[PDB]
Structures are given as structure tokens and as C-alpha cells.
Amino acid sequence: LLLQTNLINYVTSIRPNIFVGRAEGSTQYGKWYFEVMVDEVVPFLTAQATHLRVGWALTEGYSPYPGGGEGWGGNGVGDDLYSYGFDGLHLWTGHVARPVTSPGQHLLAPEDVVSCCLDLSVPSISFRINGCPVQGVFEAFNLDGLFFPVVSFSAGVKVRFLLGGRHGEFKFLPPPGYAPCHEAVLPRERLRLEPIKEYRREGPRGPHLVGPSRCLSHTDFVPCPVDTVQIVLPPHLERIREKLAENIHELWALTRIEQGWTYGPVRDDNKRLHPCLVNFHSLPEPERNYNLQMSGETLKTLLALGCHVGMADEKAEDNLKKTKLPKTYMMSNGYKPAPLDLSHVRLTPAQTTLVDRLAENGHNVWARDRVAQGWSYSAVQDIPARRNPRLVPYRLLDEATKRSNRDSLCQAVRTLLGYGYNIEDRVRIFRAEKSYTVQSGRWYFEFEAVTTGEMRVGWARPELRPDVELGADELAYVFNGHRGQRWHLGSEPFGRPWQSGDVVGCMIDLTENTIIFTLNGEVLMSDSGSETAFREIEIGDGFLPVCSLGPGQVGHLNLGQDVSSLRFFAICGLQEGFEPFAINMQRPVTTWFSKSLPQFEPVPPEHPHYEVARMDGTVDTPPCLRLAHRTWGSQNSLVEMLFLRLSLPVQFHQDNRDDPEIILNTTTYYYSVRVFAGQEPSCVWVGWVTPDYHQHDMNFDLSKVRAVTVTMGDEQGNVHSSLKCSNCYMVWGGDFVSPGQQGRISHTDLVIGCLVDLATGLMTFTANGKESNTFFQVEPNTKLFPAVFVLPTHQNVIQFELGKQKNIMPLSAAMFLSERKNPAPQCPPRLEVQMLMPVSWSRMPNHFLQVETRRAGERLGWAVQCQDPLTMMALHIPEENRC
Amino acid sequence: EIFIYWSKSHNFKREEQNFVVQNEINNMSFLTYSVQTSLIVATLKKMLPIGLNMCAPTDQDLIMLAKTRYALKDTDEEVREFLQNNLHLQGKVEGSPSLRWQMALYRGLPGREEDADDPEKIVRRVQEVSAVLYHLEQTEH
Amino acid sequence: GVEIETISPGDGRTFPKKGQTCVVHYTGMLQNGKKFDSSRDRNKPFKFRIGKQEVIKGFEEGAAQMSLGQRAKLTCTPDVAYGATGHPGVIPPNATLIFDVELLNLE
């Protein structure tokens, strides 16, 4: 009942830039393997404990912000269920730790080597400490995103990443078929140790602020070309099918003999006898057909894309010959390339624009057949393993490799042209604490622009909203610099854009209500003559400095506190009279940023669209909570996520007349949900949620739910416990409609009832009095919130019913201790409807881990260490397991 | 000086307005009824920070005193004499919190601080800026 | 009873004997995750004797089977700990206790 408080630690995470995933193909070793070696660990450097876990994580949901979080704060690999870790004797997933059996279980003591293995064929993660296997694995976790190694630590540990050799030497032999994590390096980028989803980075002259990162999806490695299935290949194009083939064949043969290739039986550069030096009609059968289909696809790309070609000339083609070649092209057996004349024609700039698209398509088609055969990308080239470092489809390939594909495509296009035939996470908003609102005087703060992009700086009202971009409402006066604009309610241009480094001096003046923005020493001018950005501003509650860095953008806010540090203060602003926003402050101004973590908040009483009404229970109906869409006519309509503001914990196991001897001793509890007629049941989900549900999806379904399975067994198989962990237990409303009724709009309301047994953890659902065949099992000490996910298609959408059944102890008996044995439905004012909000404000810690987790690429692996302690005073809310 | 010569005479303003309307000079393209677009006024507005820089923030206390003295159609000589008669009213560096960083900025980055002691130069550098600030007020009003 | 586990190994041959002062650093918590009392926040160890209990009896069983620095997780059941009388403002009547104990005794 009372808000708790305690002293907790600061926990961070460090990951390498290695991402793996499961998709249609092109990124599939199926298995990966890496190790973490512990050098030294102080167990009790501080009062609470020392935190150190290793494991894997997901790139779409794992985002531990420093400070509070789920439970008692200090979130690392483990909590939030998007990561799977192992401390030294526990398998951390979801939020609860499950002990595991090991030969000599102990915490991560110094000189300990823990090896984690990831398998994507069957989704499973396994760990091995000091060679001995750990009798516990994860299973059946959804592969929506990419997987990367991660280690979580807090103030006192020192570990090393032994990835794959040449980036950290191994200590134990990996299981067969497992890559040593040193592939998938994405040769456009190098290897690094970086934090996960940071919003503040130390810089040369202060803390830089960082916007959302540009993360990679798991559907990026799969190559998809344009559709060329329906290509007629008319006779004029069909005739030039082989005619083009040997031209590229001989040109590639001479490009191969550039390094000195010769005709022979076995391909080895040291042996120098790769068979590649015959004519097209004399090529070996295996690759012949592949060459024909590639040469044809070269034409099918043009045909499918458009650019209707035509036979401009034929007489010139009949007289074209083969250019002379020196004796260097001659090789011992006797082969000689026959390159067609190429200088007789020149491609127009349109052809130079369109040639690279054909190379883009060709590389995708080339990769497609390779992944169809069973080839996957690998940093280390291995021909017997059916790999080479070129399966990245187009967009993440090194520019050194990119030139060969477009060279070959350009030669093919110029061969066609020579033979006649002419050819035709949204925004990270930074702010200041609301106690710094200014209602008098003149102020001046700067904002360096390290990178050029969508970044906005200005003055905003203290009641600024985080889910709306700056300038869309009357609560902000910012200056966009990507193109040059002033944003109060529109996008009127206000000068010139920035460059790589451009301090913007924003000054407000509340004496005559003006706002002026300056570039590096120059006052910005609007279109005609204004010399000021905004005038006659109605001063109300106050103004605060603001910043709106976009995705992949870095800025630097200098409010003040150091007049000498202000680069362009003396030039413009000082003489007119402008006190910097922080002058007589011995402590830096605390900033507040919009944290993109969806949390549940009560429905506002003045919501534009949704409305919740409480109705008392009559003699026939129980107390109810109705939801109505008050603007169903011509307004917004989108999915929404709701649950009731109170939970119910599961106890530890270690006519219509109700008779007392069963109702007063039962442990079942009931609540029902009624779907009004007209709202499609296929868009309604009814069930329960754990206090760690943070999915604000727009295409939600039962297949996008988070799930995992932890299996415990002895030292060979014989599993004992198989617990299924999730954060959403509901049943789709589209499974309770008869096939005959499906196909139109019905007129009978659908009622779904959910029963929870707090003594055995059994979960059942009934629809219209009919028991369903789906059930769930939960664990002791589990908090569940009655949740309904609905997509509105009506102005009468959904209605919660705190009903009752035959001695089933209505729901208002477990959430309240006073009414423990009261068999009467109730709805106290504390029990309300809470909706899911996309983003919310948050506080930036005054002092982060100032040691910055000192890491370096040492010879014996990548070492990361933390040394200084850090503590904060948490505030735990009991009903919702937050901190 | 040219600005105050223009201000303390009606014929100068009349002739400038007549010249502008007769030649139809834009008077806005140079700076990239139409008093706010006047050439002299814009030039003085651009050059005013030069004059403000040479004045110490301590002279801000005597700025209003000089303005009040000039409010009675006073001359430069009598204003300078009156200022020198009570040149001890400036200062209050320790009496206010907003003056500490101003003095620090004045002392730190620039070069020589006017030899740090020149009673004769103080009134000379205060009178001109006070007259300019006074004459600038009527243009906006 | 007690369900003593292992977190950090000790010596295995220096078990406490009768009439000896045991020095421990312990952190207590109920069987729901809410910590109720700890000794490290007070920056002082806890001293108690065998045969002069002055402590809950389950804590005594847990500290009995330790060896010079063995970190353990003791689980104390009702009728082994404070029991039905509970503690005003402190552990509720029917609840079990989990202690993270470290026997750093120097004799």
C-alpha cells in the first residue's frame, strides 16, 4: 500500500557489433559460439551486491535504460524477457531466476570461462562453464529480430570477449557446426564494443546527446529481386540470348587471367589451373545452364523494369569485329579471348543511371540461387564449407567489391547497345526540468550540431507532450535546421541549413516577447525583413530549452554554467544583454528526455476519441466498465491496449443459489468481457497480462506474443521441469464465431469469461457459457492484470464485466483484502481502465557510469571493465512491479 | 556623431525622406514612415556593440545618471563635468551577483583593460555611449 | 527446516564449534522478493554464539553448516523462525525467510 524505497545499483550492458538471425535465408550458419572470460570480480564492492550475467539478447526489444525499470531496477541480460542470460547458477529470463544444476555451482568467480551457444534451426541457447555443460537450455523463443551477444555488469567486474580467434583466443573446442562468432561482421563495418540504445555519449567538450540508432532488421539479409517470372522473351530478344553470353564469358576469362589464370583440371591459385578458358559452346555442362539463365536474366531485368527496347540498327552489327589482343592473353594450351569492339558506342547518361539497377538485380538473383543451394555468408572464406564473404545482397557490401558487378553489367549493356538495338524510434526529445521555467529577463543558450539531419532546437512550454513532434502544436518554438524552418504551427522557412559543426544561439526575450535564433555569429533572417523568429508571444506558465534530435543524430547542448565555454556568446547576445540560461548554478541543469518505453496510464477524462463510463450493477447486471468511441464518424481509429489498474497475485502452493460451504472456501475468481454487437470478434482479444508487457504493436495477433521455454534436466536428458514463460495470456475472439455466422455482421453480443485459480495456477476461458479447449498454467507469485485488446469498429466497442458465477468468488475479492469473503461484485474507484501510451517522459541521471566502461581491443580478447560504484534511491510501486 | 547630428535637426530628416521618396531608393537591399529602414539608423544599430564593448559593465551604473543629465538638453562638456564631480558612484561589483561574471569576461579574453586606471577616459567613453543610447530612443518612438 | 544452498565455496574443513562467536554478513528477505533487513547497510557485521542462541533457530542451523567464507542461501520455514506471532511492522505472521549469509568469522 505504501510506496517503498531502497538503494539499488547502476547496471549497464556491453555488446559486440555481431548480429545473427533466422529468415528465409542468406544468413544461416544455424549455430554460433562465443566465450566470456572473467578476470576479476569484487562480490560486495557496494552495499547491495555485484551484478554480472552473460548471454544473448534481441535487437528489437532489449533496451535497458540506466536507472529504474522492472522490479527493483538494475536491468541487464535477463529481465524484460527479450534477453536470455546465466549468472553463475541461474537461468535468467522474463524476470524470475530459475536455479540450474552444475558440477560445482558457484557465482562468476575470477578465472571462469563461460561459453554460450546459440542454435537457430531449433531455437535453443545453451551454456557451458569451464567446459562442463550446464543442465538447462532455453527453447521456443520467437525469432523476430536479430541476436547479439551481451554481458551485463555493475561497478567492479572485468571480463574479456573471446570471440573467434584473431579477436580473442579460445579456451575450449566449440561444438561441431558452430561458428566462432567472428563471422557476420558485415564488411562495411568493423568490430566494436558498444552500449545498447544509448542517449548520452561523452565528448571532447561535454556530454553529447544521441538520438535513436538505425538498427538492422532480420529481413535485410534476405535478397529479393524484381519479378521476372512472366517474361515472354520475344524472338528478337530471344535470338540475342547466347550472342551476349560469350562476350561476358571471354571478358570475365581475361579478367580472371589478369592475375594469371590458366586452363587446367583443378582450381587452385597456387596451382594456377582453374578450368575457365574455353568458349561458351565448349564450357562444362554443370555451370553452362547457370550461365545461360544468368545471361537471359540480364535481358529479363530490362524487359520487366520497362524501358521498351527496339532494333535501331542491324547493318552496323553485321560489320562489327573482334579487337586485337597481345600475346599476354595467349596461354599455354592455346586459348585466346575474343573481346568484341567496345569503343564504337557510348552509353547516354540515362544508360549510366540504369546500368547499376541491373547490377543490383543481378547480385540479388545470384545470391538467391546460392541460398537455394545452401550457401551462407561468412567473414572467413571457406569453399568446402560452401561459403564466401559475398552473400550480403546489395546494401551492406564493401565498395571495393561493388565495382566488379557494375563493371560486368556495364559491359553487357554496352554489348547490347553496340549491336544496334537501342535501349531506352521516432524522435528523442530532450528538455529541462519544469522547475527551471523562466518568466522574466533575457536568456541565451547554444546548441552545437555535430551531425546534419532532422534536429530541432528552441524554447518549449513546460507542458510539452512527448508523443508529438516539436512545432506541431502551440507548445514549442523551435528552429529546424535540416532545410531551415521555424516551427510553431507550420513550416515557414527561416534561413539556411547547418554544416558539420554549427553552433545555434537561441535567445528569448520576455520583456517584449520575442524569440531570435542565430547561426555562428550571424542573426538569422526570415523571408522579407523580420530579423526575429516569433513576436508578441503570450507569456504564460514559462519557457524551457528543448532539443529534438532525430534518428542517427548527435548534438551538444550548452545551456551555460561556463561563460568562457560559450563559443559565440561575446559576438552576438552579450552586448544586447542576455544572461546564459545557467549562470549562478553550482550544479548542472538536469534534463528530461522522452523515453520510448510503452507504459500503461489511466484514460484521460477528456480524451478526444475514447470515453470510459462506470455503471452501477442493477438487480440483473453486475458492475460494468463500458468503452465508447465518441468520434466514430470522421476521426481516428486504431488498435488500443487496455487492462484494469489492479492485479491479483497467485498464492504459494507450498435457482442460482450459492451455498456457504463451497463459496467461502473456494479459490477460483471470475471476470467476464462482453463484446457488443457490431464490433467484429476477430479484432478483440480477452485475457490477462503480467506487469512487464511493453508491446505497443499496430498489427497485434497471437503469433506476435512473447514466449520462451526453460527446460531443466539431469546430466543426460530426462528433463524434469519445462516451464512456459510469457507476458500475455489471452484467446482470440475470432475463434468463437460459427462458420455459418461468419461472413456478415451479426446481432448477438459475444461474452467471454476468464477463470483464474489462485491455488493451482490453472487458467480457463469460456465463451457464451461454452468451455473452450485452451488453457494456461502460471507460476506462484505471478501478478496478472485483466486485459482486453480491441480494434474499434463501432461506437460501442467493449465493456468490462466484474461479474459472478456459481460460487466462483467474483473478481472484487482477490484484489482487496477487506472484501476477501464477500460474494458480491464490486468496483471501487481505484479499479479503473488504463490504456497503453507510446512514449513517456523520463529523468536523465545526473552522473552516469563516468568510468564509461573502459574497453579496449586487447590481444587476448576484447576487455571491458568497470571500477567506480554508483547508487541511486529507488521508489518501488507495489501494485505494478516497477521501480 | 553623424547620428546625433541627424537626430537633433528636423531638416536632415525631411531631406533624407524626400531624397528617398524622390529617387525611390529601396533602403532595404543595402542591409539585405520608413524610419526603421533608414540608412543612418541601421548603421548605428549595427555599430552599437562596438561602442558598448569599450564601456566597462561598471559604467552601466553611471549610464542612467548620464542619460538623466542629458534629459535636460545638457551639453557634452557639462555632462562630463557633472559625471567627473561624482565619479565614485560606479562599481558595486561585490553588491550584485550579476556583475561577477561580467567583470570576469571583461578581464579574461580581451587584451589590455585600458591600463585599468583612467579617470579621464571613463567620462569620455561614457558620455558618447550615453548620448547615442538617448538619441536611439526617440527613433523607435 | 533449512534448505541451505551454495553461492561461493569456502574451505569445507573449518566448521564452527560449540562456544564460538560466529561473524556473518547477511541480507534477509521474505519469500516474495521484498527485503526486510540487511547487515551490510549498517556497515557492521553480526556476532552471535552457539548455545546462547539470541537468534532465530533456523539461522542457527544455517550458520552451523558453514566453513570460513561459504556464501549460502538459507530458507527458514514457520515453526523454524518467528512463526505465527510474526513481528509488528516486520515479517507478517505466516511467511518464510530467505537469508543470503556469508560467514566471514575471524574467531
Ligand SMILES: O=C1CN(/N=C\c2ccc(-c3ccc([N+](=O)[O-])cc3)o2)C(=O)N1
Ligand atoms: O563465384 C565464383 C564461381 N567461380 N567459378 C565457377 C564459375 C564459372 C563461371 C563463373 C563466372 C563468374 C563471374 C561471372 N561474371 O562476372 O559475370 C561470370 C561467370 O564462375 C569462381 O571462380 N567464383
